[PDB]
Structures are given as C-alpha cells and as structure tokens.
Amino acid sequence: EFRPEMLQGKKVIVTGASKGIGREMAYHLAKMGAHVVVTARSKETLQKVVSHCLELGAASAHYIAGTMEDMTFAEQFVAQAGKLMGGLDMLILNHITNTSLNLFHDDIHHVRKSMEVNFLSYVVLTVAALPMLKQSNGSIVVVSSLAGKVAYPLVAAYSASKFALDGFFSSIRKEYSVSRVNVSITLCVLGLIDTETAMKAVSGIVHMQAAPKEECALEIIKGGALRQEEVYYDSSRWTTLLIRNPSRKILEELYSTS
Amino acid sequence: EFRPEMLQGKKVIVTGASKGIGREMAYHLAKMGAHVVVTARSKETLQKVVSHCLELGAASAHYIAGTMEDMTFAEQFVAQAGKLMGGLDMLILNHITNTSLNLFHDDIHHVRKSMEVNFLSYVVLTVAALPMLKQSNGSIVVVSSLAGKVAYPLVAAYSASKFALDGFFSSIRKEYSVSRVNVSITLCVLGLIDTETAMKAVSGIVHMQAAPKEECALEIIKGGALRQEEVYYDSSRWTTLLIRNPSRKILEELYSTS
Ligand SMILES: NC(=O)c1ccc[n+]([C@@H]2O[C@H](COP(=O)([O-])OP(=O)(O)OC[C@H]3O[C@@H](n4cnc5c(N)ncnc54)[C@H](OP(=O)(O)O)[C@@H]3O)[C@@H](O)[C@H]2O)c1
Numbered sequence: 419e420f421r422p423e424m425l426q427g428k429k430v431i432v433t434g435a436s437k438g439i440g441r442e443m444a445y446h447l448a449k450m451g452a453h454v455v456v457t458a459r460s461k462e463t464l465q466k467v468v469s470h471c472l473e474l475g476a477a478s479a480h481y482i483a484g485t486m487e488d489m490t491f492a493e494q495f496v497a498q499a500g501k502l503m504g505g506l507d508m509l510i511l512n513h514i515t516n517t518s519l520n521l522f523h524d525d526i527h528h529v530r531k532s533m534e535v536n537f538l539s540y541v542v543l544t545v546a547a548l549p550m551l552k553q554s555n556g557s558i559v560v561v562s563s564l565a566g567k568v569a570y571p572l573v574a575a576y577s578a579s580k581f582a583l584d585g586f587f588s589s590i591r592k593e594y595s596v597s598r599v600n601v602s603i604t605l606c607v608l609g610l611i612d613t614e615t616a617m618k619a620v621s622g623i624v625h626m627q628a629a630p631k632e633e634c635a636l637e638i639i640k641g642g643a644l645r646q647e648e649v650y651y652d653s654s655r656w657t658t659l660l661i662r663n664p665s666r667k668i669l670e671e672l673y674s675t676s
Numbered sequence: 677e678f679r680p681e682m683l684q685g686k687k688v689i690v691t692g693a694s695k696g697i698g699r700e701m702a703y704h705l706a707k708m709g710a711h712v713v714v715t716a717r718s719k720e721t722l723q724k725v726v727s728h729c730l731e732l733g734a735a736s737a738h739y740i741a742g743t744m745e746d747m748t749f750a751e752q753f754v755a756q757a758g759k760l761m762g763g764l765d766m767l768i769l770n771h772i773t774n775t776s777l778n779l780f781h782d783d784i785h786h787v788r789k790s791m792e793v794n795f796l797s798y799v800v801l802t803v804a805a806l807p808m809l810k811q812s813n814g815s816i817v818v819v820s821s822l823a824g825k826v827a828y829p830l831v832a833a834y835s836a837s838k839f840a841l842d843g844f845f846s847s848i849r850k851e852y853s854v855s856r857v858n859v860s861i862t863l864c865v866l867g868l869i870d871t872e873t874a875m876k877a878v879s880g881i882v883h884m885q886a887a888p889k890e891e892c893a894l895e896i897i898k899g900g901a902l903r904q905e906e907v908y909y910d911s912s913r914w915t916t917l918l919i920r921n922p923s924r925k926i927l928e929e930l931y932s933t934s
C-alpha cells in the first residue's frame with residue numbers, strides 16, 4: 419500500500435547521504451518530490467548529490483557538511499536542517515564510521531569510535547529532532563544490519579554499535595507507545611548490500627550475494643512511510659524467513675498486556 | 677554435571693562485588709575455595725566482602741577500589757589482580773553505572789555514561805585479561821539482562837548497553853571459534869533479581885516477581901564453570917522458554933563456513 423505521493427512535500431533528513439544507500443535514498447526522495455537535507459563529511463560530494471536531487475524533482479534540496487564524531491555538529495545540524503525546511507517529517511539515520519573485516523585485536527579505539535559515531539550520534543540527532551517530529555507526528559528511520567541482530571566474526575565493534583541501536587530505539591518505541599507520542603520508529607535490518615564500500619571490504623574474504631543498493635534504499639523509505647517497526651532486506655529469501663523473532667514479540671507483549 | 681569443586685583454587689575477578697549479585701558471587705566462590713579479587717568504588721564495603729570471603733574459606737581474597745568510568749583504572753586493576761593471584765582463570769564482569777526507571781527525554785549524559793561503564797569498561801577489562809585467560813584456557817562471564825535481549829520502556833540507555841554486550845561478546849565468541857582461542861564467553865540473561873538496588877528502583881513503578889540473588893549468583897558461576905554460551909535466570913518458566921532465539925543460532929550456524 420506504499421504510494422510515492424506519501425513523500426511529496428515531506429521534510430526529510432538523510433545522514434551518510436554522499437554515497438551508497440544514503441545517496442540512493444536522497445535520489446528516491448527527490449523523485450517523489452520531498453524536501454531533502456543531506457549530510458556527510460565531503461562538502462564537494464554532497465553538492466553533486468544536491469544538484470542531482472534538484473534535477474530529479476525534489477521540492478528543495480540542501481546539504482550540511484561535517485563529522486558525526488562531533489556531538490555539537492549533530493545537535494546544531496538538526497536545528498539548521500529543520501530551519502531550512504520549516505519543519506521535519508522524517509529523520510533517516512544512516513551514517514557509520516569507516517570499518518573493515520578484521521579480527522578484534524587490542525582495538526578499544528575502533529570500539530569507542532564505532533560506538534560514538536554509529537550509536538551515540540544517532541541518539542543526539544533524535545533528541546534534537548524530536549520537538550519537530552512531535553509537531554508533524556513524523557518518523558525516525560534507523561538503518562541497521564543483520565549483524566545488529568545476529569553474531570558474525572570480523573565485525574565485533576560494528577555489531578556492538580548496531581545491537582546498541584536496537585536496544586535504544588526499541589525501548590523508546592515502547593515508551594512512545596505508552597506515552598502516546600505518535601513518532602514512529604523503523605529499525606532496518608539489512609543483509610550485505612552492493613555499495614562500493616561493502617564490495618571493497620568483502621573482496622576475497624566473504625562469498626555472499628549482495629543485494630542492489632537502489633532497491634534497498636526504496637525498501638527503507640517504504641518502511642518509514644508505512645511506519646513499519648522493522649524492515650528486513652536481504653538477497654536470500656531463506657535468510658529473510660529466519661530473521662523474525664516471534665518469541666521476543668510474545669516476551670514484550672507479556673509485559674505490555676500486564 | 678556442575679560440581680562446586682570445579683572452582684577450587686581457581687583465580688577469579690568479580691567486578692561490582694561490594695553488594696547485590698556481585699557480592700553473592702564472591703561469597704559462593706569463597707565457599708568453593710577459590711582465589712578472589714573483588715572491585716567496586718567503596719573501599720569500606722569491599723573490605724567487609726574480603727573479610728567474609730576469608731571467613732567462608734577462600735584460598736585468598738583481595739580488594740582493589742576504583743571507578744570503572746576510569747579506563748586507566750580498569751587496565752591497571754586487571755594487571756594488579758593478576759599479580760595478587762599469580763594468574764587468572766575467570767573474569768566476572770558485573771558492574772553497571774547507577775540506573776533508575778525513567779522515561780527517556782534528553783539525558784545524553786546518562787546514555788554516554790551507561791555506554792562507558794556498562795559496555796566500554798567491559799571491553800577494556802577483557803583486553804587487559806586476555807593474555808592471562810589465553811594461558812590458563814579461562815572464562816569471561818558477562819552479566820546482562822532480559823532488557824539486553826528484549827525491549828521494555830524506562831530503561832533505554834541501560835538496554836542499549838546490554839544489547840551492545842551481546843553484539844560485541846557474541847561476535848568475539850565466533851572469532852575465537854576461528855582462531856581457536858580457548859577462552860569461553862558466558863552471557864547471563866537475567867530477569868528481575870531481589871537486590872536492594874532493584875527493589876528500591878521498581879518501588880511504585882513496576883510490579884514484577886524478583887528471583888533470589890543467592891541462586892542467581894550460583895547459576896552465573898555454574899554457567900561460567902560449564903563454559904555455557906548463555907545462562908538464563910528468571911522467576912517465570914514461560915519467559916525462560918521464550919528467551920532462546922533458535923532462528924539466530926540457525927542463521928549463525930548456516931553462516932559458519934569459509
Ligand atoms: N553495504 C552493506 O553491505 C550494508 C549492510 C548492512 C547494513 N548497512 C548499513 O547501511 C548504512 C550505509 O551503508 P553504506 O554501505 O551505503 O555506506 P557508505 O557507502 O560507505 O557511506 C557511508 C556514509 O557515511 C558517511 N560518513 C562516514 N564517516 C562519517 C562521519 N564520521 N560522520 C558523518 N558521516 C560519515 C560517508 O561520507 P563521508 O566519508 O564523506 O563522511 C557516507 O556518506 C550503514 O548504517 C550500514 O551499517 C550496509
């Protein structure tokens with residue numbers, strides 16, 4: 419029941435939108451006629467994305483350059499982006515810190531930096547965005563991974579940050595449901611996707627089929643527009659059948675009902 | 677299968693061992709004739725734990741006081757504990773930052789502090805302990821929560837840190853399966869426990885049956901001794917059945933190739 423018209427004139431933020439899945443989401447939103455504000459560290463790459471977004475038919479497109487390692491940048495970013503659009507309908511949280519497939523050695527540094535960038539910056543962005551999202555009865559879209567639901571070797575710091583996202587965002591979704599805050603939260607569980615980053619990282623190490631980044635970007639936007647609690651997107655139909663955790667839903671509902 | 681004799685003469689670190697579950701674990705290990713090193717911030721409270729451990733029959737008992745907000749203290753603590761005992765067989769990670777039941781609003785200070793103390797310091801402690809645990813084919817015991825596997829309101833920052841523990845420690849367990857490091861990792865999934873902190877925190881907010889802290893503590897040591905991947909301890913039989921995620925283990929084992 420998704421309709422591309424669900425996004426026309428909507429005010430959307432997309433993080434990590436200079437390349438990969440983030441860039442594909444900005445292009446999709448542009449084609450749907452949304453107002454977009456994209457962010458990443460590369461000002462030059464973001465300018466090119468914003469230009470193609472206006473070409474594609476966006477109601478408006480702007481960018482704000484900076485690092486999500488900086489919590490002051492994150493807080494101010496949401497305010498600046500909201501002031502540029504005159505509100506906020508959907509917050510798409512998609513950036514991560516650069517990571518590789520390697521065994522955990524003595525890297526507290528990569529663990530701390532992955533936690534600050536992949537998890538804490540998302541919380542700061544939410545807190546900053548929530549007054550406008552409350553006014554619009556908007557949506558928060560949190561891009562995660564299969565490695566955020568299940569254990570795989572070579573991605574320990576990454577997995578920790580992605581598991582932290584589920585814990586945080588699913589707990590506040592329960593709070594919003596009980597306090598009657600009509601701000602939806604969509605957690606996106608993605609399998610391996612064919613971005614230049616993933617294809618380089620995975621070469622000669624992993625032998626899995628990667629899914630198309632364009633289709634993946636559209637499935638995230640659909641999830642958010644339909645206010646779905648979770649989106650599952652993987653190349654395998656077998657993997658997609660096993661990802662759902664019905665016991666967790668019963669365990670949550672047992673507490674919820676009583 | 678378990679025998680208390682499995683802990684006799686074992687060299688064990690217990691963090692957050694001045695009260696609650698941590699103190700009860702130190703007491704059980706002491707009765708079992710283990711060597712124990714306890715930590716927490718209160719030197720006066722730890723002294724009383726050390727005294728009673730000797731009275732109970734510990735092979736040796738020592739305390740080191742400090743805050744796990746200090747990563748330098750965490751590193752130095754393991755090294756000092758190791759010297760005190762002449763090695764290390766088991767590392768029990770149990771401390772958390774002080775937490776109360778509250779709806780999340782704008783407390784990034786509590787989010788960051790929960791991630792630093794409940795998750796980051798566990799990693800730091802693990803890195804510092806790994807050479808000794810590798811040499812003794814030791815064990816890492818990670819105290820988590822049902823809120824570290826499932827979503828509940830009033831504990832967002834807390835849940836994120838416990839979910840982060842699962843992601844990190846379960847990913848490293850898969851890595852030890854490839855490098856064949858003989859260090860076991862036990863994640864303990866606990867329901868509400870009758871500790872003084874929890875009874876005061878739930879008062880007038882939540883109505884749930886708490887399980888006993890003495891049996892909780894023993895159940896944790898037993899899972900550590902038997903090198904189990906997960907320990908489940910909850911007052912309900914239904915919830916104990918539902919905490920297992922068999923789709924996750926299929927998804928993980930189906931990946932365990934290449
Ligand atoms: N591709 C996959 O296989 C896969 C699988 C599962 C989940 N996912 C998830 O999908 C999302 C995007 O993945 P992707 O492959 O499309 O990534 P990507 O192509 O490498 O893009 C990452 C984006 O984040 C930005 N970024 C990097 N460091 C940053 C920082 N410190 N501050 C702010 N922004 C930063 C990058 O731009 P700058 O370098 O200019 O800052 C870029 O715009 C991530 O959350 C990822 O975990 C991907």
Ligand SMILES: NC(=O)c1ccc[n+]([C@@H]2O[C@H](COP(=O)([O-])OP(=O)(O)OC[C@H]3O[C@@H](n4cnc5c(N)ncnc54)[C@H](OP(=O)(O)O)[C@@H]3O)[C@@H](O)[C@H]2O)c1
Nearest residue numbers: 692693694696697716717718743744770868869871873874
């Ligand atoms: N009780 C429950 O219902 C329950 C349920 C599920 C899971 N758990 C888990 O079980 C574990 C123990 O819980 P508990 O209820 O027994 O806790 P507790 O009685 O409140 O004890 C917490 C311990 O951590 C220490 N601590 C606090 N802050 C610290 C810091 N900054 N640095 C170092 N140490 C610190 C405390 O002593 P000082 O204040 O002197 O430092 C104390 O020794 C935790 O991991 C908790 O998440 C408990």
Ligand SMILES: CCc1nc([C@H]2CCCO2)c(C(=O)N[C@@H]2[C@@H]3C[C@@H]4C[C@H]2C[C@@](O)(C4)C3)s1
Nearest residue numbers: 517563564565570573609610615616619624
């Ligand atoms: C199929 C299940 C998944 N495994 C991985 C993991 C486990 C094995 C391979 O990837 C996933 C994942 O999220 N990979 C990301 C890609 C590849 C790597 C690691 C992570 C972040 C990246 O930037 C680099 C994009 S999803």
Ligand SMILES: CCc1nc([C@H]2CCCO2)c(C(=O)N[C@@H]2[C@@H]3C[C@@H]4C[C@H]2C[C@@](O)(C4)C3)s1
Nearest residue numbers: 775821822823828866867868873874877882
């Ligand atoms: C059985 C499901 C659980 N709910 C909670 C949650 C949801 C409602 C009650 O606690 C659990 C939990 O881990 N509680 C802890 C107690 C009570 C509070 C919060 C947390 C940390 C404490 O120090 C204070 C001990 S386990």
